[PDB]
Amino acid sequence: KPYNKIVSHLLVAEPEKIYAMPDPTVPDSDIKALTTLCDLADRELVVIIGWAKHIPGFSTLSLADQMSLLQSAWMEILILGVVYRSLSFEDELVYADDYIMDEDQSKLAGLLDLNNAILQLVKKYKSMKLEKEEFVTLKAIALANSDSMHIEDVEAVQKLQDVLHEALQDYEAGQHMEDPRRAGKMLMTLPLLRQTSTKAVQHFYNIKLEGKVPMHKLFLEMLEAKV
Amino acid sequence: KPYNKIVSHLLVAEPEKIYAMPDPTVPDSDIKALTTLCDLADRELVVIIGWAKHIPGFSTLSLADQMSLLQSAWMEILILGVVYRSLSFEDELVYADDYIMDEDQSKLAGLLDLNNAILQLVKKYKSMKLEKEEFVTLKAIALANSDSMHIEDVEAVQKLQDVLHEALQDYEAGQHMEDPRRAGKMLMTLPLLRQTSTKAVQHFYNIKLEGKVPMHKLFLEMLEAKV
Ligand SMILES: CC(C)(c1ccc(O)cc1)c1ccc(O)cc1
Ligand SMILES: CC(C)(c1ccc(O)cc1)c1ccc(O)cc1
């Protein structure tokens, strides 16, 4: 009852912080903000792919299934990260230590409604006192449970889901005896994450079509996935 | 260990079957199909409002909170119903006993992608052997967990969520000892339901804007909710 090994493992597999590095020579605009954010996402996607390899059983899936899970889950993983980084803040989203968006900035970027939904995720997790252990486990569950239409080995993916769910259940049983239903409460946060991700993918797909915001190869690869 | 009372109660509160009654004098078209479906939804929404009153604690919320939960959850409740009605069928959606859509009909109605996602929900629940007891409990959880941005009494809504989650957990502990993680598996089906609902609301909102498909008052009320 030092806690669950999978949880411990995900904690040490957690990537280091990444800076956004908005270009200080460029005038502030919606284009600058969206460019900065998509550039940051592209770099994060590299680290997310590397991170996934540490999840027990993930690297044993076919390359096609690994890619399918990542192409369905990437936005949820990105959003859960900004959510977690923002828990100790008030009405602000910490995309990076050097890129914190308040309401005015979100409006300027055309992201008021989307960032408000992300702040809704933040609000609920603040009330629940979301722990880092729970965050990393939920990121892994979101990956495994992402509902790609293209899975080859359905049973192996369900097995991965079960392994990660078990880890969450075991963690909560040991760490949160005061609330025997806390694991389920955690799982019940996933629908809002999925809802927000679905809308964010459509939003940025539309930005891609408009062609005014430069996007890098990996971000585009994820955005152009069939979902 | 005759099972959970809330589950038993939801089972007897289950509304009776409703027929679609497509107009046999009208030529088949996309407009006919969509008209028929939205008409059916309108009638179902009446029965769903009545049904919600049977859920322990729901009628004790403010009228505003009851409406907020229903306006966020209605599409999920409707979709979970067609999903459940379709479990014993193959690649067909049983909107009603007299309205069963196959792939060609979905294409004709402009609903291929949406109905395919609903069939994805069906596929997963068939594999899990979803029971009526679990269906009705999930409908109630979807209502309570619908993530409206407009809730007045956040704590009372979280209490309702907990009561219903407890019922699911208790049901599974008694009925499914072979799988100590089945309740969580059930909760993990909710993200796809939310994803599909989010897309369906947008789809039918766009049909509303186009103005070619007649819609009744209650369906419109739900569709025009701020979400
Ligand atoms: C994908 C997006 C550019 C992003 C970038 C980086 C990040 O850490 C999280 C999310 C994003 C999505 C939704 C949103 O409202 C703002 C930004
Ligand atoms: C809301 C909709 C008209 C409906 C009507 C009735 C129903 O039982 C379930 C869903 C609907 C949603 C999504 C969809 O693909 C088809 C029909």
UniProtKB/Swiss-Prot annotation, chains A, B:
Organs and tissues of expression: Expressed in the heart, kidney, brain, lung, bone marrow, adrenal gland, trachea, spinal cord and thyroid gland.
Residue ranges of domain NR LBD in the record: 2-226
Location in or out of the cell: Nucleus
PTM entry text: Acetylated by PCAF/KAT2 (in vitro).
Miscellaneous note of the record: No physiological activating ligand is known for this orphan receptor, but 4-hydroxytamoxifen and diethylstilbestrol act as inverse agonists and deactivate ESRRG.
Summary of subunit composition and partner proteins: Homodimer. Binds TLE1, PNRC1 and PNRC2. Binds GRIP1. Interacts with NRIP1, NCOA1 and NCOR2.
Function field: Orphan receptor that acts as a transcription activator in the absence of bound ligand. Binds specifically to an estrogen response element and activates reporter genes controlled by estrogen response elements. Induces the expression of PERM1 in the skeletal muscle.
Family recorded in the similarity comment: Belongs to the nuclear hormone receptor family. NR3 subfamily.
Full protein name: Estrogen-related receptor gamma
Organism expressing this protein natively: Homo sapiens
Full-protein positions shown: 232 to 458 of 458
